[PDB]
Design an enzyme around this catalytic site. Structure first.
Site, short mmCIF file in Angstrom:
data_model
loop_
_atom_site.label_atom_id
_atom_site.label_comp_id
_atom_site.label_asym_id
_atom_site.label_seq_id
_atom_site.Cartn_x
_atom_site.Cartn_y
_atom_site.Cartn_z
N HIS A 41 0.83 -1.23 0.00
CA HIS A 41 0.00 0.00 0.00
C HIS A 41 0.85 1.26 0.00
CE1 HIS A 41 -0.03 0.12 4.57
NE2 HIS A 41 0.41 1.29 4.18
N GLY A 142 2.94 5.63 10.39
CA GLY A 142 4.31 5.37 10.04
C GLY A 142 4.91 4.10 10.61
N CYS A 144 3.64 0.89 9.74
CA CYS A 144 3.39 -0.25 8.88
C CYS A 144 4.69 -0.77 8.28
CB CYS A 144 2.40 0.14 7.78
SG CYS A 144 0.68 0.14 8.33
C1 LIG Z 1 0.73 1.90 8.52
N1 LIG Z 1 1.56 2.83 8.21
C2 LIG Z 1 -0.67 2.13 9.07
C3 LIG Z 1 -0.80 1.60 10.49
C4 LIG Z 1 -2.06 2.08 11.21
C5 LIG Z 1 -2.10 3.55 11.59
C6 LIG Z 1 -3.03 3.59 12.79
N2 LIG Z 1 -2.82 2.28 13.39
C7 LIG Z 1 -2.32 1.38 12.53
O1 LIG Z 1 -2.13 0.18 12.77
N3 LIG Z 1 -1.67 1.52 8.20
C8 LIG Z 1 -2.48 2.25 7.43
O2 LIG Z 1 -2.37 3.47 7.30
C9 LIG Z 1 -3.59 1.49 6.72
C10 LIG Z 1 -3.49 1.68 5.22
C11 LIG Z 1 -4.69 2.50 4.77
C12 LIG Z 1 -5.55 2.78 5.98
N4 LIG Z 1 -4.90 2.04 7.07
C13 LIG Z 1 -5.38 1.87 8.31
O3 LIG Z 1 -4.75 1.22 9.14
C14 LIG Z 1 -6.73 2.50 8.65
N5 LIG Z 1 -7.67 1.48 9.13
S1 LIG Z 1 -8.84 0.99 8.13
C15 LIG Z 1 -8.91 -0.76 8.21
O4 LIG Z 1 -10.08 1.50 8.65
O5 LIG Z 1 -8.44 1.36 6.81
C16 LIG Z 1 -6.60 3.68 9.63
C17 LIG Z 1 -7.94 4.41 9.74
C18 LIG Z 1 -5.54 4.67 9.14
C19 LIG Z 1 -6.20 3.19 11.02
C20 LIG Z 1 -4.51 1.09 4.28
C21 LIG Z 1 -5.48 0.02 4.75
C22 LIG Z 1 -4.08 0.90 2.84
#
Ligand SMILES: *C(=N)[C@H](C[C@@H]1CCNC1=O)NC(=O)[C@@H]1[C@@H]2[C@H](CN1C(=O)[C@@H](NS(C)(=O)=O)C(C)(C)C)C2(C)C
Ligand SMILES: *C(=N)[C@H](C[C@@H]1CCNC1=O)NC(=O)[C@@H]1[C@@H]2[C@H](CN1C(=O)[C@@H](NS(C)(=O)=O)C(C)(C)C)C2(C)C
Lengths: 298, 299
Positions: A41, A142, A144
């Protein structure tokens, strides 16, 4: 002495963490050999809407990647999908690549998380795999690409890479083969986690650790059979125990057989009545029997 | 997004851990430069009774020492007491000695424990120094010499070395200058730990972490003045808060003043009533304000 989560040391994993950047996304990658694994992603032009990943792959420019570690800039020469992970071949080989295998974690098994913040290892802690394939850790922006790992008989296994957090706060990642744990989509969706199923193996080990800590208020003189507990467990979202053999040592040391703790589980599942067990207010299932035995006895 | 008791990475500390044996006693030592630091009771002939360390030092023999790391062995050329620690000079300088300093830990501060067994690092976890100079670790047999450390502003500090476990289960160690935390003696005696005083700074930070993670049942339309809480605190074994200024950012993010959480503490101290706060059934003072701010917001 109590009972607390421990992490196996991070020495072999930290030199493999790199900062991976593409556009507005900044996260972590795992640098092994001339390969760098990261959540795919990272190349998404917009993480607030549905992503077509092969459209992003056909429009990807390797010159826009920023893969670095300390003061070393790693040039990306090839990009390919592998499941939900992006595999980037870089021009330099990691001189500190450890001997390692890849392994998948099953529900109720414990592993370690090296929480990395935009390529910088910041902390390390132990987690446990819930029934639906998630874990309960502490991830923020940040983080992931943070790596899960576990060492078994001097063998280092890479088992987890973080991807997202669900609406209920559960954390979702994949193995290093690109298969998402629990099969969740790598999309900014509203997808739900299933009903959680407590690992009864771990709750019993948790209760044995409390008896070693001198906490015995939850143990009465009533016993509950294995068969009767297993019939109760499936209608109350608990796993069924195959046997009581894994607790032979813990039962002899504490003076309480598994059947005594099985009755405790059924009573304590309705509420602790204001009391606490190892500072917890509810049943904890994040400690495997092997974990408790090693932490209490070595 | 979650709250977990975290440990800082251990990569710079693992290559400094060594196994130290003397006679039938085995424990861990800290190898920095050409010096190895260990607990001095490794030369005690009898850990069962009160140890006369002056007699043990007089009858010590350098060649009876054995310190090693991954099959490579070091010869001890000098042994000396420094407080409750032994400082052994060895015939090889640790090639992986990191830039480091030495530092003492104050009550309510957090640091990282690298638990070791016979020179092999086994696990790493975070702890918090209690008011009487103890920590609620998980040290068992063979973990003496396990090293505590903390990383602040890219500076590595060695702050703790494990010695004993009091009768109440609490764990007592020394800093790296030989001074035992809390003034306890390195003797197999029934030393009593004093009254534990809960860190109110840490409890407030814990409740702020709860609000950030969606827990809010403990906050009501009530709020307690700082002086009123401090008077209650001195009665119920809680630290007094000098001010609320360390929580300025946390108060803005959650919209809850410290004074509102101060009344939560007074109410929650009488029991949670069957409710939980991030799995906890009781108040927890193991997280500093800096720990929480960094874990919740990165910084
Ligand atoms: C990695 N950099 C993040 C980790 C996140 C940030 C908050 N807690 C975590 O574990 N991952 C993402 O940003 C991830 C990316 C985009 C949206 N996303 C999410 O974790 C979201 N959750 S969700 C399932 O509702 O999309 C959110 C709202 C940012 C926590 C994608 C899934 C591509
Ligand atoms: C190091 N190998 C141990 C660590 C101990 C083992 C159990 N948990 C720990 O933290 N240190 C000792 O064995 C230490 C040595 C001898 C007595 N001692 C103790 O920790 C004892 N506690 S006490 C205060 O009652 O003496 C005991 C009974 C072994 C736990 C000396 C202080 C020299």
């Amino acid at each position: 002495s109590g009972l607390r989560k421990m992490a196996q040391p991070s020495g072999l994993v930290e030199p493999c963490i790199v900062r991976v950047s593409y556009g507005n996304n900044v996260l972590n990658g795992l640098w092994l050999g001339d390969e760098v694994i990261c959540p795919r992603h990272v190349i998404a032009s917009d993480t607030t809407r549905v992503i077509n990943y092969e459209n992003e792959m056909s429009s990807v420019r390797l010159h826009n990647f920023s893969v670095s570690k300390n003061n070393v800039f790693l040039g990306v020469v090839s990009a390919k999908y592998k499941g939900v992970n992006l595999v980037l071949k870089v021009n330099q080989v990691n001189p500190n690549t450890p001997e390692h295998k890849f392994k998948s974690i099953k529900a109720g098994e414990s592993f370690n998380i090296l929480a990395c913040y935009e390529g910088c290892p910041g902390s390390v802690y132990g987690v446990n795999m819930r029934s639906q394939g998630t874990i309960k850790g502490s991830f923020i922006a940040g983080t992931c690409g943070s790596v899960g790992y576990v060492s078994e008989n001097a063998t280092l296994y890479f088992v987890y890479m973080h991807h997202l957090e669900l609406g209920n706060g559960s954390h979702v990642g994949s193995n290093l083969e690109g298969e998402m744990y629990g099969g969740y989509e790598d999309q900014p969706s509203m997808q739900l986690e299933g009903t959680n199923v407590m690992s009864s193996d771990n709750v019993v080990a948790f209760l044995y650790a409390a008896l070693i800590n001198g906490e015995r208020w939850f143990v009465t003189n009533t016993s509950m059979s294995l068969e009767s507990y297993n019939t109760w467990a499936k209608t109350n979202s608990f796993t069924e125990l195959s046997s009581t053999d894994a607790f032979s040592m813990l039962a002899a040391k504490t003076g309480q057989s598994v059947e005594k703790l099985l009755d405790s589980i059924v009573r304590l599942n309705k509420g602790f009545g204001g009391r606490t067990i190892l500072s917890y207010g509810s049943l904890c299932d994040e400690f495997t029997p092997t974990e408790v035995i090693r932490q209490m006895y070595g």
